[PDB]
From Swiss-Prot, chain B:
It comes from the Viruses. Glycans are attached at T4, S6, N12, N24. Residues 1-16 are annotated as: Disordered. This is Spike protein S1. It comes from Severe acute respiratory syndrome coronavirus 2 (2019-nCoV).
Amino acid sequence: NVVIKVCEFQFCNDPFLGVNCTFEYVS
Amino acid sequence: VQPTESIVRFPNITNLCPFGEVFNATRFASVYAWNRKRISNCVADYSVL
Ligand SMILES: *[C@@H]1O[C@H](CO)[C@@H](O)[C@H](O)[C@H]1NC(C)=O
Ligand SMILES: *[C@@H]1O[C@H](CO)[C@@H](O)[C@H](O)[C@H]1NC(C)=O
Ligand SMILES: *[C@@H]1O[C@H](CO)[C@@H](O)[C@H](O)[C@H]1NC(C)=O
């Protein structure tokens, strides 16, 4: 899906996906 | 020509925003620390309670 969240998050210096949330959604 | 009646259309009521869990959950917490709530979108509220 398309998947979404607003979560206050500590992202990396090079964030990726492999080969504390007040809202979330899917499509 | 006068309007013979009123008509209203709003979309299928869909995101009942969930009161269900906040009044069904087996594990209601003790006084000190409990649970909490947040809002997403659409119309839920109703009047079941
Ligand atoms: C992909 O999106 C779906 C949306 O339902 C989610 O269940 C799943 O955890 C997601 N996976 C990744 C790797 O983002
Ligand atoms: C989670 O969000 C709340 C928002 O008030 C904040 O108090 C808390 O410190 C946050 N914690 C983390 C680990 O993001
Ligand atoms: C709890 O669940 C029952 C059905 O199992 C339902 O009739 C009742 O209204 C629920 N309570 C609330 C308001 O969550």
